[PDB]
Amino acid sequence: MEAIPVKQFVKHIGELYSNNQHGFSEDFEEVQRCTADMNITAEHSNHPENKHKNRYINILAYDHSRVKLRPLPSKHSDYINANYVDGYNKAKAYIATQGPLKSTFEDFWRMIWEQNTGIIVMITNLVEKGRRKCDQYWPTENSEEYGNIIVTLKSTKIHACYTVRRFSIRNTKQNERVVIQYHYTQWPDMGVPEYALPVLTFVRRSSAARMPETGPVLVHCSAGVGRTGTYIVIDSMLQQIKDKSTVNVLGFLKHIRTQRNYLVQTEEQYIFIHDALLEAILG
Ligand code: VO4
């Protein structure tokens, strides 16, 4: 399970696709099993005091990698359903988290301040097929206050497949920071877009916007695992291709699966990762 030379990768994808995607099915099933002999604790996610702070009962934050909020002057005020996730050759390159609930808006923005995050990647719509996926944690216009964080919408650009919102935030304790949200608007929950190029462009533009030297890029959808994990793997493998001209989806995915449960939720999303890299390689 070593890295694959980029010049051999598209051929590799053809083989994985063949025979009703036998190879992809094997890879993904190996991913889903790779936790088998691993118990990973998530005591804080399961504590009664924190239950209401989880969007989904089955979607937890592993203790070892969870993002801690600085405690407030409650015993569990340190909890948010969020995990550090590695990037290419960089620990804690991302924070992967659920779509914030109204009850966690303050926690969410406090994390962003405390972690010095400058980029938010959002990969879900607020509502999909009439179903609630994420509450709107930013102001529709002008400014809104979440705890001691005041968020001000500065500009918006709406492209065909994603929207870029530029915010200014400040701590009432003032100190101000730019936060840019990259919001992909056409990616269904538990699904994949038909074409990978628009997501490839989205990943390239949102990744390039990362400022040195700043906090982890925050990535979320609704549960914060499926689309979120898919983004993280594509971004990370683009980096590896840039650095070493090799690709290691299977190995990198098995690794981050120890950092937050269920990253990359479906075989279809697993395949979509490969399609995006293929588009980059051939392009
Ligand atoms: O909102 V997700 O189901 O893509 O983790």
mmCIF file of C-alpha atoms and ligand atoms in Angstrom:
data_model
loop_
_atom_site.group_PDB
_atom_site.id
_atom_site.type_symbol
_atom_site.label_atom_id
_atom_site.label_comp_id
_atom_site.label_asym_id
_atom_site.label_seq_id
_atom_site.Cartn_x
_atom_site.Cartn_y
_atom_site.Cartn_z
ATOM 1 C CA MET A 1 0.000 0.000 0.000
ATOM 2 C CA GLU A 2 2.677 2.494 -1.073
ATOM 3 C CA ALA A 3 2.200 5.746 -2.993
ATOM 4 C CA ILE A 4 1.228 5.475 -6.652
ATOM 5 C CA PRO A 5 3.232 7.358 -9.305
ATOM 6 C CA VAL A 6 0.953 10.046 -10.736
ATOM 7 C CA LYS A 7 1.847 8.895 -14.248
ATOM 8 C CA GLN A 8 0.294 5.517 -13.400
ATOM 9 C CA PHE A 9 -2.730 6.780 -11.473
ATOM 10 C CA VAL A 10 -5.319 7.177 -14.228
ATOM 11 C CA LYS A 11 -4.541 3.666 -15.452
ATOM 12 C CA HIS A 12 -5.050 2.609 -11.833
ATOM 13 C CA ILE A 13 -8.473 4.272 -11.821
ATOM 14 C CA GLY A 14 -9.466 2.352 -14.932
ATOM 15 C CA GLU A 15 -8.633 -0.881 -13.155
ATOM 16 C CA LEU A 16 -10.588 0.131 -10.026
ATOM 17 C CA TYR A 17 -13.617 1.019 -12.167
ATOM 18 C CA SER A 18 -13.624 -2.255 -14.084
ATOM 19 C CA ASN A 19 -15.965 -5.179 -13.362
ATOM 20 C CA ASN A 20 -18.700 -3.082 -11.771
ATOM 21 C CA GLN A 21 -16.135 -1.178 -9.711
ATOM 22 C CA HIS A 22 -14.841 -4.297 -7.974
ATOM 23 C CA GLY A 23 -11.559 -2.607 -7.099
ATOM 24 C CA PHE A 24 -13.213 0.483 -5.631
ATOM 25 C CA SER A 25 -15.540 -1.711 -3.564
ATOM 26 C CA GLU A 26 -12.538 -3.609 -2.188
ATOM 27 C CA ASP A 27 -10.667 -0.407 -1.316
ATOM 28 C CA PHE A 28 -13.619 1.194 0.405
ATOM 29 C CA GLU A 29 -14.567 -1.940 2.326
ATOM 30 C CA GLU A 30 -10.960 -2.066 3.506
ATOM 31 C CA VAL A 31 -11.382 1.527 4.676
ATOM 32 C CA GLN A 32 -14.567 0.712 6.547
ATOM 33 C CA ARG A 33 -12.892 -2.267 8.231
ATOM 34 C CA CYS A 34 -9.669 -0.478 9.144
ATOM 35 C CA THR A 35 -11.168 0.659 12.455
ATOM 36 C CA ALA A 36 -12.245 -2.891 13.330
ATOM 37 C CA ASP A 37 -9.420 -3.718 15.725
ATOM 38 C CA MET A 38 -9.429 -0.160 17.065
ATOM 39 C CA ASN A 39 -11.394 1.155 20.011
ATOM 40 C CA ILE A 40 -11.301 4.954 19.839
ATOM 41 C CA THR A 41 -12.872 6.740 22.782
ATOM 42 C CA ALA A 42 -15.354 9.588 22.511
ATOM 43 C CA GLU A 43 -16.336 10.055 26.148
ATOM 44 C CA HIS A 44 -16.968 13.781 25.863
ATOM 45 C CA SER A 45 -19.294 13.439 22.879
ATOM 46 C CA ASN A 46 -21.321 10.856 24.797
ATOM 47 C CA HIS A 47 -21.591 12.788 28.058
ATOM 48 C CA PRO A 48 -25.196 13.750 28.934
ATOM 49 C CA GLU A 49 -24.265 17.423 29.259
ATOM 50 C CA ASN A 50 -23.023 17.492 25.654
ATOM 51 C CA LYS A 51 -25.771 15.491 23.935
ATOM 52 C CA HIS A 52 -27.698 18.556 22.758
ATOM 53 C CA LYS A 53 -24.497 19.865 21.162
ATOM 54 C CA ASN A 54 -24.348 16.959 18.683
ATOM 55 C CA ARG A 55 -26.375 17.283 15.480
ATOM 56 C CA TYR A 56 -26.450 13.514 15.016
ATOM 57 C CA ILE A 57 -26.365 10.959 17.846
ATOM 58 C CA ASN A 58 -24.223 8.556 15.824
ATOM 59 C CA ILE A 59 -21.722 11.179 14.635
ATOM 60 C CA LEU A 60 -19.151 11.728 17.383
ATOM 61 C CA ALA A 61 -15.871 13.517 17.993
ATOM 62 C CA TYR A 62 -13.037 11.187 19.008
ATOM 63 C CA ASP A 63 -11.488 12.349 22.311
ATOM 64 C CA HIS A 64 -7.856 12.312 21.205
ATOM 65 C CA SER A 65 -8.314 14.598 18.206
ATOM 66 C CA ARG A 66 -11.241 16.747 19.385
ATOM 67 C CA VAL A 67 -10.968 20.524 19.324
ATOM 68 C CA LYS A 68 -11.119 21.930 22.827
ATOM 69 C CA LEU A 69 -12.765 25.233 23.612
ATOM 70 C CA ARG A 70 -11.091 27.197 26.393
ATOM 71 C CA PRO A 71 -13.234 26.603 29.497
ATOM 72 C CA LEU A 72 -15.716 29.313 30.517
ATOM 73 C CA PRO A 73 -15.570 30.934 33.994
ATOM 74 C CA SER A 74 -19.578 24.822 33.014
ATOM 75 C CA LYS A 75 -17.517 21.644 33.325
ATOM 76 C CA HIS A 76 -18.360 20.763 29.728
ATOM 77 C CA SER A 77 -18.113 24.202 28.146
ATOM 78 C CA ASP A 78 -14.981 22.916 26.426
ATOM 79 C CA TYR A 79 -16.910 20.635 24.077
ATOM 80 C CA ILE A 80 -17.680 21.056 20.396
ATOM 81 C CA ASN A 81 -18.318 18.242 17.910
ATOM 82 C CA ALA A 82 -15.158 18.921 15.931
ATOM 83 C CA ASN A 83 -11.839 17.162 15.254
ATOM 84 C CA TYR A 84 -8.388 18.152 14.075
ATOM 85 C CA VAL A 85 -7.574 16.277 10.876
ATOM 86 C CA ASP A 86 -4.166 15.987 9.237
ATOM 87 C CA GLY A 87 -3.414 17.322 5.793
ATOM 88 C CA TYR A 88 -0.550 16.435 3.492
ATOM 89 C CA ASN A 89 2.622 16.516 5.560
ATOM 90 C CA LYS A 90 0.938 18.780 8.113
ATOM 91 C CA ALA A 91 -0.709 17.805 11.387
ATOM 92 C CA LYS A 92 -3.970 19.529 12.306
ATOM 93 C CA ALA A 93 -4.284 21.067 8.836
ATOM 94 C CA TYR A 94 -8.088 21.009 9.165
ATOM 95 C CA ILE A 95 -10.828 21.176 11.690
ATOM 96 C CA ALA A 96 -13.640 18.870 10.541
ATOM 97 C CA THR A 97 -16.900 19.688 12.266
ATOM 98 C CA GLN A 98 -20.678 19.351 11.960
ATOM 99 C CA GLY A 99 -22.916 22.102 10.696
ATOM 100 C CA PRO A 100 -23.472 24.304 13.784
ATOM 101 C CA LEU A 101 -26.784 24.178 15.631
ATOM 102 C CA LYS A 102 -28.388 27.374 16.908
ATOM 103 C CA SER A 103 -27.407 26.143 20.377
ATOM 104 C CA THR A 104 -23.752 25.891 19.288
ATOM 105 C CA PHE A 105 -23.354 29.078 17.220
ATOM 106 C CA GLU A 106 -21.425 30.728 20.041
ATOM 107 C CA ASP A 107 -19.172 27.682 20.497
ATOM 108 C CA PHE A 108 -18.609 27.574 16.755
ATOM 109 C CA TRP A 109 -17.420 31.168 16.442
ATOM 110 C CA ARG A 110 -15.429 30.935 19.667
ATOM 111 C CA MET A 111 -13.550 27.986 18.167
ATOM 112 C CA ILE A 112 -12.870 30.007 15.052
ATOM 113 C CA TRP A 113 -11.454 32.842 17.125
ATOM 114 C CA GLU A 114 -9.439 30.657 19.508
ATOM 115 C CA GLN A 115 -8.025 28.525 16.675
ATOM 116 C CA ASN A 116 -7.194 31.539 14.508
ATOM 117 C CA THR A 117 -9.102 30.032 11.591
ATOM 118 C CA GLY A 118 -9.264 32.193 8.479
ATOM 119 C CA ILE A 119 -11.039 29.893 6.019
ATOM 120 C CA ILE A 120 -14.409 28.149 6.362
ATOM 121 C CA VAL A 121 -15.290 25.471 3.783
ATOM 122 C CA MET A 122 -19.003 24.701 3.803
ATOM 123 C CA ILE A 123 -20.180 21.817 1.604
ATOM 124 C CA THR A 124 -23.890 21.547 2.275
ATOM 125 C CA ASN A 125 -26.897 23.770 1.736
ATOM 126 C CA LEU A 126 -28.830 24.885 4.817
ATOM 127 C CA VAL A 127 -31.814 22.863 3.613
ATOM 128 C CA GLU A 128 -31.758 20.030 1.080
ATOM 129 C CA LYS A 129 -34.892 18.428 -0.365
ATOM 130 C CA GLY A 130 -36.931 20.170 2.314
ATOM 131 C CA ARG A 131 -34.687 18.699 5.021
ATOM 132 C CA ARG A 132 -32.726 20.718 7.598
ATOM 133 C CA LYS A 133 -28.967 20.184 7.170
ATOM 134 C CA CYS A 134 -27.376 23.278 8.724
ATOM 135 C CA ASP A 135 -28.599 26.383 10.564
ATOM 136 C CA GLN A 136 -27.408 29.730 9.242
ATOM 137 C CA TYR A 137 -24.563 30.726 11.555
ATOM 138 C CA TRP A 138 -23.674 33.908 9.676
ATOM 139 C CA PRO A 139 -25.588 37.187 9.073
ATOM 140 C CA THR A 140 -27.670 37.486 5.902
ATOM 141 C CA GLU A 141 -26.636 41.137 5.817
ATOM 142 C CA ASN A 142 -24.467 43.487 7.873
ATOM 143 C CA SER A 143 -23.507 42.255 11.336
ATOM 144 C CA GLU A 144 -24.604 39.696 13.916
ATOM 145 C CA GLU A 145 -23.334 38.830 17.386
ATOM 146 C CA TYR A 146 -22.592 35.344 18.687
ATOM 147 C CA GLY A 147 -21.360 35.591 22.251
ATOM 148 C CA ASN A 148 -18.352 37.896 22.277
ATOM 149 C CA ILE A 149 -17.807 37.439 18.546
ATOM 150 C CA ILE A 150 -19.365 39.950 16.150
ATOM 151 C CA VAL A 151 -19.479 38.828 12.529
ATOM 152 C CA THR A 152 -19.826 41.336 9.690
ATOM 153 C CA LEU A 153 -20.591 40.353 6.103
ATOM 154 C CA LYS A 154 -18.350 42.456 3.851
ATOM 155 C CA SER A 155 -18.813 41.022 0.364
ATOM 156 C CA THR A 156 -20.379 38.111 -1.498
ATOM 157 C CA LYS A 157 -19.689 36.556 -4.872
ATOM 158 C CA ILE A 158 -22.020 33.894 -6.205
ATOM 159 C CA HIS A 159 -20.533 31.613 -8.845
ATOM 160 C CA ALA A 160 -22.387 28.798 -10.616
ATOM 161 C CA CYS A 161 -21.427 26.062 -8.157
ATOM 162 C CA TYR A 162 -20.183 27.888 -5.083
ATOM 163 C CA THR A 163 -20.443 31.164 -3.195
ATOM 164 C CA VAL A 164 -17.643 33.129 -1.514
ATOM 165 C CA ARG A 165 -18.573 35.246 1.509
ATOM 166 C CA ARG A 166 -16.010 37.594 3.049
ATOM 167 C CA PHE A 167 -16.497 38.375 6.733
ATOM 168 C CA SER A 168 -14.831 40.579 9.298
ATOM 169 C CA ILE A 169 -15.061 39.283 12.862
ATOM 170 C CA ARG A 170 -14.091 40.933 16.130
ATOM 171 C CA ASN A 171 -13.919 39.877 19.762
ATOM 172 C CA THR A 172 -15.849 42.214 22.069
ATOM 173 C CA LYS A 173 -13.686 40.676 24.804
ATOM 174 C CA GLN A 174 -11.482 45.550 19.227
ATOM 175 C CA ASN A 175 -9.246 42.981 17.531
ATOM 176 C CA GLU A 176 -10.486 42.157 14.017
ATOM 177 C CA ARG A 177 -9.852 39.272 11.617
ATOM 178 C CA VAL A 178 -10.835 38.410 8.056
ATOM 179 C CA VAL A 179 -12.687 35.130 7.643
ATOM 180 C CA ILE A 180 -13.569 33.857 4.175
ATOM 181 C CA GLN A 181 -16.270 31.239 3.723
ATOM 182 C CA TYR A 182 -16.212 29.023 0.623
ATOM 183 C CA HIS A 183 -19.674 27.541 0.258
ATOM 184 C CA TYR A 184 -20.208 24.785 -2.319
ATOM 185 C CA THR A 185 -23.875 24.910 -3.224
ATOM 186 C CA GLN A 186 -24.501 21.872 -5.455
ATOM 187 C CA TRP A 187 -23.376 18.744 -3.573
ATOM 188 C CA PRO A 188 -26.173 16.482 -2.220
ATOM 189 C CA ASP A 189 -25.861 14.741 1.165
ATOM 190 C CA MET A 190 -24.617 11.147 0.797
ATOM 191 C CA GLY A 191 -24.192 11.798 -2.919
ATOM 192 C CA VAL A 192 -21.722 13.173 -5.419
ATOM 193 C CA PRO A 193 -21.946 15.747 -8.224
ATOM 194 C CA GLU A 194 -22.058 14.213 -11.702
ATOM 195 C CA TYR A 195 -18.897 16.032 -12.766
ATOM 196 C CA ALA A 196 -15.727 16.491 -10.740
ATOM 197 C CA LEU A 197 -14.247 19.563 -12.397
ATOM 198 C CA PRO A 198 -16.435 22.098 -10.559
ATOM 199 C CA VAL A 199 -15.401 20.590 -7.224
ATOM 200 C CA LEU A 200 -11.755 20.495 -8.303
ATOM 201 C CA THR A 201 -11.977 24.215 -9.033
ATOM 202 C CA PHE A 202 -13.695 24.800 -5.686
ATOM 203 C CA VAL A 203 -10.947 22.894 -3.858
ATOM 204 C CA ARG A 204 -8.191 24.748 -5.703
ATOM 205 C CA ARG A 205 -9.611 28.200 -5.018
ATOM 206 C CA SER A 206 -10.479 27.550 -1.377
ATOM 207 C CA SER A 207 -7.127 25.884 -0.704
ATOM 208 C CA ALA A 208 -5.151 28.694 -2.343
ATOM 209 C CA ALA A 209 -6.913 31.181 -0.070
ATOM 210 C CA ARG A 210 -5.240 29.681 3.008
ATOM 211 C CA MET A 211 -3.017 32.353 4.564
ATOM 212 C CA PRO A 212 0.412 31.713 6.068
ATOM 213 C CA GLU A 213 0.647 31.443 8.866
ATOM 214 C CA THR A 214 -2.846 30.886 10.216
ATOM 215 C CA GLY A 215 -5.008 28.349 12.015
ATOM 216 C CA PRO A 216 -6.504 25.149 10.558
ATOM 217 C CA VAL A 217 -9.008 25.414 7.694
ATOM 218 C CA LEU A 218 -12.494 24.639 9.032
ATOM 219 C CA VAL A 219 -14.461 22.190 6.872
ATOM 220 C CA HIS A 220 -18.049 21.199 7.504
ATOM 221 C CA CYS A 221 -21.175 19.860 5.869
ATOM 222 C CA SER A 222 -24.127 18.602 7.915
ATOM 223 C CA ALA A 223 -22.641 15.693 9.885
ATOM 224 C CA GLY A 224 -19.132 16.856 9.033
ATOM 225 C CA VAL A 225 -17.807 13.513 7.798
ATOM 226 C CA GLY A 226 -18.846 12.530 4.271
ATOM 227 C CA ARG A 227 -18.518 15.545 2.008
ATOM 228 C CA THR A 228 -16.091 16.995 4.522
ATOM 229 C CA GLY A 229 -13.791 13.982 4.311
ATOM 230 C CA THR A 230 -14.019 13.937 0.546
ATOM 231 C CA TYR A 231 -12.847 17.556 0.393
ATOM 232 C CA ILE A 232 -9.968 16.891 2.757
ATOM 233 C CA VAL A 233 -8.670 13.918 0.771
ATOM 234 C CA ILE A 234 -8.880 15.728 -2.562
ATOM 235 C CA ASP A 235 -7.103 18.806 -1.188
ATOM 236 C CA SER A 236 -4.440 16.725 0.540
ATOM 237 C CA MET A 237 -3.723 14.539 -2.492
ATOM 238 C CA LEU A 238 -3.479 17.566 -4.757
ATOM 239 C CA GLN A 239 -0.759 18.739 -2.380
ATOM 240 C CA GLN A 240 1.052 15.399 -2.500
ATOM 241 C CA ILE A 241 0.878 15.387 -6.283
ATOM 242 C CA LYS A 242 2.376 18.887 -6.286
ATOM 243 C CA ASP A 243 5.171 17.868 -3.937
ATOM 244 C CA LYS A 244 6.071 14.308 -4.924
ATOM 245 C CA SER A 245 4.031 13.489 -8.036
ATOM 246 C CA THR A 246 2.606 10.493 -6.202
ATOM 247 C CA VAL A 247 -0.858 9.727 -4.861
ATOM 248 C CA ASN A 248 -1.978 7.728 -1.847
ATOM 249 C CA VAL A 249 -5.738 7.969 -1.365
ATOM 250 C CA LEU A 250 -6.234 4.625 0.366
ATOM 251 C CA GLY A 251 -3.438 5.097 2.878
ATOM 252 C CA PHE A 252 -4.224 8.719 3.653
ATOM 253 C CA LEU A 253 -7.917 7.975 4.116
ATOM 254 C CA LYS A 254 -7.276 5.066 6.477
ATOM 255 C CA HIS A 255 -5.116 7.428 8.515
ATOM 256 C CA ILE A 256 -7.582 10.297 8.906
ATOM 257 C CA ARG A 257 -10.308 7.766 9.721
ATOM 258 C CA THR A 258 -8.595 7.518 13.119
ATOM 259 C CA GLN A 259 -9.073 11.263 13.602
ATOM 260 C CA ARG A 260 -12.813 11.601 12.940
ATOM 261 C CA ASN A 261 -15.378 8.864 12.440
ATOM 262 C CA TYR A 262 -16.689 8.078 8.966
ATOM 263 C CA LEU A 263 -14.688 10.601 6.941
ATOM 264 C CA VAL A 264 -15.714 9.833 3.350
ATOM 265 C CA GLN A 265 -19.010 8.066 3.993
ATOM 266 C CA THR A 266 -19.735 6.182 0.779
ATOM 267 C CA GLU A 267 -17.988 4.219 -1.945
ATOM 268 C CA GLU A 268 -19.429 6.739 -4.401
ATOM 269 C CA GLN A 269 -17.649 9.563 -2.604
ATOM 270 C CA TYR A 270 -14.495 7.440 -2.554
ATOM 271 C CA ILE A 271 -14.732 7.123 -6.341
ATOM 272 C CA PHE A 272 -15.437 10.835 -6.674
ATOM 273 C CA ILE A 273 -12.134 11.583 -4.964
ATOM 274 C CA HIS A 274 -10.424 9.666 -7.731
ATOM 275 C CA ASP A 275 -12.372 11.480 -10.464
ATOM 276 C CA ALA A 276 -11.317 14.878 -9.122
ATOM 277 C CA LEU A 277 -7.650 13.878 -9.050
ATOM 278 C CA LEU A 278 -8.015 12.403 -12.543
ATOM 279 C CA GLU A 279 -9.353 15.761 -13.767
ATOM 280 C CA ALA A 280 -6.352 17.492 -12.212
ATOM 281 C CA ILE A 281 -3.856 15.021 -13.676
ATOM 282 C CA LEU A 282 -5.273 15.103 -17.213
ATOM 283 C CA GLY A 283 -5.914 18.843 -17.139
HETATM 284 O O1 VO4 B 1 -23.117 16.304 5.935
HETATM 285 V V1 VO4 B 1 -22.146 14.935 5.615
HETATM 286 O O2 VO4 B 1 -23.304 13.649 5.667
HETATM 287 O O3 VO4 B 1 -21.568 15.035 4.046
HETATM 288 O O4 VO4 B 1 -20.948 14.430 6.725
#
